[PDB]
Amino acid sequence: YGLFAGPCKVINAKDVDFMYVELIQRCKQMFLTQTDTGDDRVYQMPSFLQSVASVLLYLDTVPEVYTPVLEHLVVMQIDSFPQYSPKMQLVCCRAIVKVFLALAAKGPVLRNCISTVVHQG
DNA sequence: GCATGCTCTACTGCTTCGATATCG
DNA sequence: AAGCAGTAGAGCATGC
């Protein structure tokens, strides 16, 4: 999903805005709203953040309503580092580095939030 | 609940050894 | 062909 969101930019130019909304709506109601404590849906959060970063690369004109969901998700993934296994504690690092690469190459009116995600972490 | 720790037949394969086929 | 050694695909048991 998050990989082929790339080449679907040149085919619809609205489905890139349809994803990152469907994606964040799937991402919210799995580990923020319900079953935050008792669930096993934790071992795919690197794929989640990798997908959101790979669609946020191509998505211009940010909605500015879902960034308090993005930066309430990525501190959850920084929090949930040691409930893991080796050779996936590096995949989690690649996901977080990818997201921080993503939301810093578009505008300095945005990247003040990169200073409060690490403060919250 | 997915991750790590003992355990039981048992399938593949190494080694010798005798026969068979082939070439000079 | 006969013998024999070995290891692996699997089965029970316990953990943050």
End-to-end CA distance of chain A: 28
Burial A69-104 (b: 16+ CB within 10 A, else e): ebbebbbbbeeeeeebeeeeeeebeebbebbeebbe
Elucidation method: cryo-EM
Q: How many helices (H) and strands (E) does chain A have?
A: 6, 0
- Residue A85, CB, less than 7 Å from strand B? yes
Torsion angle of the four alpha carbons A11, A65, A103, A114, in this order, in degrees rounded to the nearest 10: -170
Residue numbers 86-105 of A with CB closer than 7 A to any atom of strand B: 86
Question: Degrees (nearest 5) of the Cα angle A80, A84, A88?
Answer: 105
Distance A10 CA to C16 C1' (A): 47
- Residue A40 exposed, middle or buried by CB count within 10 Å (0-12, 13-18, 19+): exposed
Residue A19 has which token pair?
A: 């994803």
- Residue A41, CB, less than 7 Å from strand B? no
